Amino acid sequence: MRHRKSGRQLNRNSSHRQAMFRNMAGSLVRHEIIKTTLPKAKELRRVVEPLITLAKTDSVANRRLAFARTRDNEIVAKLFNELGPRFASRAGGYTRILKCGFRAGDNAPMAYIELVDR
Amino acid sequence: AVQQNKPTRSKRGMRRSHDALTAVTSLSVDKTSGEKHLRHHITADGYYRGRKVIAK
Amino acid sequence: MIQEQTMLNVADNSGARRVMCIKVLGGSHRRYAGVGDIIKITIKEAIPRGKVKKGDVLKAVVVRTKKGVRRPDGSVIRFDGNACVLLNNNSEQPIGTRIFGPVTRELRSEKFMKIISLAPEVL
Amino acid sequence: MIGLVGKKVGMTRIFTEDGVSIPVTVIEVEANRVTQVKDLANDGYRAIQVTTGAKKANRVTKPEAGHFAKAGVEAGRGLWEFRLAEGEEFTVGQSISVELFADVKKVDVTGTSKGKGFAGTVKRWNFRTQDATHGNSLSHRVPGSIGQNQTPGKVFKGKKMAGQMGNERVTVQSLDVVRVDAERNLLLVKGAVPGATGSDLIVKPAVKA
Amino acid sequence: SNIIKQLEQEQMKQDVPSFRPGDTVEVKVWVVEGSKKRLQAFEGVVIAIRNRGLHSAFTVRKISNGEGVERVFQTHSPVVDSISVKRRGAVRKAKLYYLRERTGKAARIKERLN
Amino acid sequence: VTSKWFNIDNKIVDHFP
RNA sequence: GAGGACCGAACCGACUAAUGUUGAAAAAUUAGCGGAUGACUUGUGGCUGGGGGUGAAAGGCCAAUCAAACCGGGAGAUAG
RNA sequence: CAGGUGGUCAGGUAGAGAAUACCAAGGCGCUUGAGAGAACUCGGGUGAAGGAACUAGGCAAAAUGGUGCCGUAACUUCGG
RNA sequence: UUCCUUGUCGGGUAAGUUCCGACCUGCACGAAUGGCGUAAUGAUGGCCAGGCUGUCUCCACCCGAGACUCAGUGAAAUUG
RNA sequence: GAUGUCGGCUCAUCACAUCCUGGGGCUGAAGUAGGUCCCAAGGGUAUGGCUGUUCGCCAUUUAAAGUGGUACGCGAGCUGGGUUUAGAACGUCGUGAGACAGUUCGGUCCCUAUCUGCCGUGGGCGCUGGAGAACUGAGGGGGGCUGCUCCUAGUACGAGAGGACCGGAGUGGACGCAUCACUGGUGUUCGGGUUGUCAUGCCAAUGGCACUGCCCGGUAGCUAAAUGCGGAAGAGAUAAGUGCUGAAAGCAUCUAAGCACGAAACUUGCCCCGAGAUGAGUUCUCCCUGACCCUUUAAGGGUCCUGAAGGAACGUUGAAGACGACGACGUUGAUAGGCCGGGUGUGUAAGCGCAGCGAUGCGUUGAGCUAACCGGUACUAAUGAACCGUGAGGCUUAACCU
Numbered sequence A: 001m002r003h004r005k006s007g008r009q010l011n012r013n014s015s016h017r018q019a020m021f022r023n024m025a026g027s028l029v030r031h032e033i034i035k036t037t038l039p040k041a042k043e044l045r046r047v048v049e050p051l052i053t054l055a056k057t058d059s060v061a062n063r064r065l066a067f068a069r070t071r072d073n074e075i076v077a078k079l080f081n082e083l084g085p086r087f088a089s090r091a092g093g094y095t096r097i098l099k100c101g102f103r104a105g106d107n108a109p110m111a112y113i114e115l116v117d118r
Numbered sequence B: 001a002v003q004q005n006k007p008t009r010s011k012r013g014m015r016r017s018h019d020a021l022t023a024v025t026s027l028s029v030d031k032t033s034g035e036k037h038l039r040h041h042i043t044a045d046g047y048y049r050g051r052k053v054i055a056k
Numbered sequence C: 001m002i003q004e005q006t007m008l009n010v011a012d013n014s015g016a017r018r019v020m021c022i023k024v025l026g027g028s029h030r031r032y033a034g035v036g037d038i039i040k041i042t043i044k045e046a047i048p049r050g051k052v053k054k055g056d057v058l059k060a061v062v063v064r065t066k067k068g069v070r071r072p073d074g075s076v077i078r079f080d081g082n083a084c085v086l087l088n089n090n091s092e093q094p095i096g097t098r099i100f101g102p103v104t105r106e107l108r109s110e111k112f113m114k115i116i117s118l119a120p121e122v123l
Numbered sequence D: 001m002i003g004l005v006g007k008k009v010g011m012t013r014i015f016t017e018d019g020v021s022i023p024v025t026v027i028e029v030e031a032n033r034v035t036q037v038k039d040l041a042n043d044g045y046r047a048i049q050v051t052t053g054a055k056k057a058n059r060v061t062k063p064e065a066g067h068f069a070k071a072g073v074e075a076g077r078g079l080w081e082f083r084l085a086e087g088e089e090f091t092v093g094q095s096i097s098v099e100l101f102a103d104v105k106k107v108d109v110t111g112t113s114k115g116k117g118f119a120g121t122v123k124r125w126n127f128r129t130q131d132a133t134h135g136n137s138l139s140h141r142v143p144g145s146i147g148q149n150q151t152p153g154k155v156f157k158g159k160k161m162a163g164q165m166g167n168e169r170v171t172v173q174s175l176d177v178v179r180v181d182a183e184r185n186l187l188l189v190k191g192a193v194p195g196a197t198g199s200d201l202i203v204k205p206a207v208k209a
Numbered sequence E: 001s002n003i004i005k006q007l008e009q010e011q012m013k014q015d016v017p018s019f020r021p022g023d024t025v026e027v028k029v030w031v032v033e034g035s036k037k038r039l040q041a042f043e044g045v046v047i048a049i050r051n052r053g054l055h056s057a058f059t060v061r062k063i064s065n066g067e068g069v070e071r072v073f074q075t076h077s078p079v080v081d082s083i084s085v086k087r088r089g090a091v092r093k094a095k096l097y098y099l100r101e102r103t104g105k106a107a108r109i110k111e112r113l114n
Numbered sequence F: 001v002t003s004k005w006f007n008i009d010n011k012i013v014d015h016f017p
Numbered sequence G: 001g002a003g004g005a006c007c008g009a010a011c012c013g014a015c016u017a018a019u020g021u022u023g024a025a026a027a028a029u030u031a032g033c034g035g036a037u038g039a040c041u042u043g044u045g046g047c048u049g050g051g052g053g054u055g056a057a058a059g060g061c062c063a064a065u066c067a068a069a070c071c072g073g074g075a076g077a078u079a080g
Numbered sequence H: 001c002a003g004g005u006g007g008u009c010a011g012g013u014a015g016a017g018a019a020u021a022c023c024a025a026g027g028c029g030c031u032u033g034a035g036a037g038a039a040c041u042c043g044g045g046u047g048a049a050g051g052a053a054c055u056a057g058g059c060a061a062a063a064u065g066g067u068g069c070c071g072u073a074a075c076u077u078c079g080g
Numbered sequence I: 001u002u003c004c005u006u007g008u009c010g011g012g013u014a015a016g017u018u019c020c021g022a023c024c025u026g027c028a029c030g031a032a033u034g035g036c037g038u039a040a041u042g043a044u045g046g047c048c049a050g051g052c053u054g055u056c057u058c059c060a061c062c063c064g065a066g067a068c069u070c071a072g073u074g075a076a077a078u079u080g
Numbered sequence J: 001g002a003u004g005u006c007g008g009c010u011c012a013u014c015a016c017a018u019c020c021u022g023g024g025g026c027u028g029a030a031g032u033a034g035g036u037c038c039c040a041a042g043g044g045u046a047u048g049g050c051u052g053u054u055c056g057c058c059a060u061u062u063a064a065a066g067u068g069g070u071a072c073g074c075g076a077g078c079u080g081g082g083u084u085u086a087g088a089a090c091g092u093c094g095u096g097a098g099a100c101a102g103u104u105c106g107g108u109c110c111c112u113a114u115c116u117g118c119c120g121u122g123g124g125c126g127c128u129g130g131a132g133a134a135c136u137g138a139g140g141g142g143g144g145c146u147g148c149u150c151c152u153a154g155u156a157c158g159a160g161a162g163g164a165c166c167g168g169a170g171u172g173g174a175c176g177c178a179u180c181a182c183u184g185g186u187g188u189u190c191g192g193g194u195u196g197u198c199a200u201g202c203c204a205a206u207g208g209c210a211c212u213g214c215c216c217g218g219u220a221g222c223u224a225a226a227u228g229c230g231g232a233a234g235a236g237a238u239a240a241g242u243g244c245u246g247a248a249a250g251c252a253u254c255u256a257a258g259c260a261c262g263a264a265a266c267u268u269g270c271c272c273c274g275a276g277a278u279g280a281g282u283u284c285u286c287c288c289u290g291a292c293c294c295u296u297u298a299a300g301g302g303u304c305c306u307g308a309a310g311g312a313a314c315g316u317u318g319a320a321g322a323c324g325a326c327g328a329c330g331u332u333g334a335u336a337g338g339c340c341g342g343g344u345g346u347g348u349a350a351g352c353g354c355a356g357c358g359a360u361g362c363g364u365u366g367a368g369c370u371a372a373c374c375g376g377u378a379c380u381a382a383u384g385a386a387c388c389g390u391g392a393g394g395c396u397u398a399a400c401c402u
């Protein structure tokens, strides 16, 4: 049974999941479009979209709290100086997933995840 | 465990009656580009439903 | 939730200090005895000049368990340890003359009105 | 007698003034619309077919829509049937409400139980597990033996083995009726009924005692 | 679940006081020794509180006649006649289950003073 | 070779004396 | 500052259990276990040869082979 | 190819330490991947009340575990 | 070492074919193929207690690696 | 040119020569409790100590702790204590090597399932135009156990001691089904405390690693030890048994003719599956009303035009799920993610200020954060299409209508 449970496990233990989405979240903020497997792009939306509503209100307390979840001051600065104001009026849904072909090496289904006003 | 008699070439082909692949029924045609693609997938140069989503 | 081999303290002053459960009476394949349930015990240690000697086989009635009793509205009463009162083997009447500690209202029955009266506190 | 079709809303408790807590299930019984009546002449048995709920006009097919339009009834979640006793008559289009159970004391509730998936013989059939230790080799929750030697040299039909558990029709019998709430379309019964929240329940007065 | 919520509100008491873990309370409950009702009081330390609407409950611990006793009360039950806070205790926790292994001077809770 | 250790193990092999 | 002393890593072993049993491995791995200045352990070289060697002794070991090694021959032994 | 293989070199913070934990210099992620999140198997974590009732047998697990000081029986070959 | 034999008696347990103490009717002990004791020692055999526990009453949930589906490569025993 | 052994564990299944429960006859049957025989196989039918044990003795239960078959059921299901290899010793026998249904200590248990079987779950085709639903029920399976207390009643019975049948109510044990409101377990996806070390320039604040580092709490879900329900009543035909009327046989006689009772066994009644029930059933609704050519002339083949109802695919997914399947939804939209509000859990964040030599305490402050929950909201993704599916559906006979 798995009833009413949420969260992809992605064939990794918990600490390797926690650290892998922390890298992707930094990479999407910095490049504004990346290419991933479709299961890992749908699980990214629940990590990087809460980071953007956090950045909509600048304070020392929130910056120190976006830092505990990205561990990258070059990412925290972009969130609070560009992606905060840019999505100021949008209420949720800062990200768009687009399916593309299949990865050659192992036939994984691919997708492009980006920020909406890229 | 292992077989006691050699299974024939009819029992082999009956088992493989479910092994066939299914072709894609149709390919959608892009609104502006006019090129085929899988439905719900971007085309081969980044058009999806008219607009150009991947300017690469 | 008393079963065989469970060690119980003694709530009366029969002399015993620790007893072991060796059977849950009242049915075939019966697992557990709760508050108000008669059990067959054996005495594992006694005080030097009591009425009961170590090694005796007697009956007892459970009066406190730390699994607890559930009341009609959903409440629970749990204690810090399991306790029993020693009974005569045939008449099933108390052997001692005092009860220590609180008891509960699941003993309020025609058999154990002797115990209810003696208890310092009934919950 | 006939029953109604409801919907498992949830479970809660009712406190009585004398300090007893009753676990109740809340069944939400809207109006059931009679959409077809069967008779011995045409069908060979007596029954009514009822519908309940609402459905979006987009998802009703042409054959389904034309069956409701004949009765003059607006579409519903599904269609169920109850067998009529002797002396009960119902007419097409009328509505049946939860006040039917006003003086009923006990009910029988049917629903589809929670789906457990492929389950083992320890969960499904209450088999005992074997030793955890003491030398056991890869056989901790496995079934054990499944038959005898050369006589009879086969496994008997109906042997208890692992397979699909749950997700199937179940009936619970002789449940009390703690309260009928006709103004809110509610029916509180005492205890637990099969299915998960939001499932469809069928409620009939108890056939037994 | 507006349907369930409505059924819940009609049964809740409106006068439950505010307490938190560590406090000392009297709970007066109704007992029925045969055919006459009566109140008897339970004194102890609130060691746990469960906030669930009508399903709320709290656990009180006392030492009675040399035996420790825990009682879980359903807050909105009609059996609980009244709850009365006697002392306020300062704790850092939400559930004080470590008080099960402490007796005498080791199981002392300090007053809150505010 | 010859083994198939369970064709050499003589608890398994020498089972009926 | 003695000791076939003590506790304990490297090092040498192999008491228990689980895994593996067409293995990752023709004897291992994991977790614990014993000795650990000595009748210890290890590198390089040397000597003992088949009814023979060597053996704190188990018929143990002598190139994955041991109640008589391996290779070639007698030899196409003989086979109610 | 989860085995075997002699010698030399020997940083920091805690530590008695070449143990153990995290790091430096330096070196690597072990040559199939992507999903899903059934029974069962393997390796682990937690568990109400009871506490060896399990079993051939407390097997296996759990528990104990350090430094300083106080205290320590029978028996003895006078060292334990 | 004792077949008869679970000898009988005592102890320990609610209950003890094992254990400990005795008795002597030693099938079929016995004095360097040594007898009877023995402190310390033993990955030695038997038995009992305390602590501790998923060993068990009686299992439940969770974390990973397989098992399952997709793409790639691709065996084996066995067989009138 | 191999059919693995005793006991244990797991899982059973049949017989009836019946252990309990059910029904009866006789009793050296007053009552309670028995003895013995007949009918009856629906369900039920102990836990421990000792021993390798099956057995047995013993302790304590139970309504009872049945007797057997199944390769003395079951090792391609587990074990490996015993017996039954190689080591060693004792007693005894032998000059000896050695031997012992004498004892004692130690001692490697393989298999990825082709076929039948069984448990689940799909694809194809059929059911005679196509499609969407609701049914009937041939048949098949599941279930079936019982204690104690009270009333009737200290009545019937008996000198007393003792103490009922029949009938009713209540409450339990064991077993099964469901469920998560409660009481709890879990909760490596939530909050906190804390040890060592490394890093973010440093302080403050945080992160990585140490089994989730070690711990303390805990949401949803799953779950039991939690809490609801169940076993029936009734009917039919009976077994053993008991009869009524009644001759053969002037009587008698349950039987020959005729009539009646009679049990947990049987057929129903309760619960689930079920039209591949090829004997392929019924009911309701919806859709299709175009030409032409050819031949070997018939349920024939072909061309153009047409493409319905519906379905599948694809996408967003689920209290559904190994994969299929099943359910919900696809802009005329709450399907999922985010977002907004709440709840819940943790337990008074950071920053700043004040008191203190400092650790630290206090105030702002029940603060900050909060997973799977509840109530909302088109912000993001669920596309205009394309695909499959046709174009009124055979012959004979009958009954009506033209």
Ligand SMILES: N[C@@H](Cc1c[nH]c2ccccc12)C(=O)O
Binding pocket: F003, F005, F006, F008, F009, G021, G027, J108
């Ligand atoms: N079974 C084990 C040990 C073993 C090796 N050779 C054997 C010969 C006979 C018996 C056992 C063995 C293995 O395969 O590794």
Ligand SMILES: [K+]
Binding pocket: D123, D124, D125, D126
């Ligand atoms: K079950």
Ligand SMILES: [K+]
Binding pocket: G001
């Ligand atoms: K020295």
Ligand SMILES: [K+]
Binding pocket: none
């Ligand atoms: K040397």
Ligand SMILES: [K+]
Binding pocket: G050, G068
């Ligand atoms: K030789």
Ligand SMILES: [K+]
Binding pocket: I001, I028, J091
């Ligand atoms: K002898």
Ligand SMILES: [K+]
Binding pocket: none
């Ligand atoms: K004795």
Ligand SMILES: [K+]
Binding pocket: none
């Ligand atoms: K004794």
Ligand SMILES: [K+]
Binding pocket: none
């Ligand atoms: K000696």
Ligand SMILES: [K+]
Binding pocket: I042, I044
């Ligand atoms: K030894």
Ligand SMILES: [K+]
Binding pocket: none
């Ligand atoms: K010893």
Ligand SMILES: [K+]
Binding pocket: none
């Ligand atoms: K049998």
Ligand SMILES: [K+]
Binding pocket: J016
């Ligand atoms: K018979």
Ligand SMILES: [K+]
Binding pocket: none
């Ligand atoms: K009988």
Ligand SMILES: [K+]
Binding pocket: none
């Ligand atoms: K009789």
Ligand SMILES: [K+]
Binding pocket: J041, J042
């Ligand atoms: K029977």
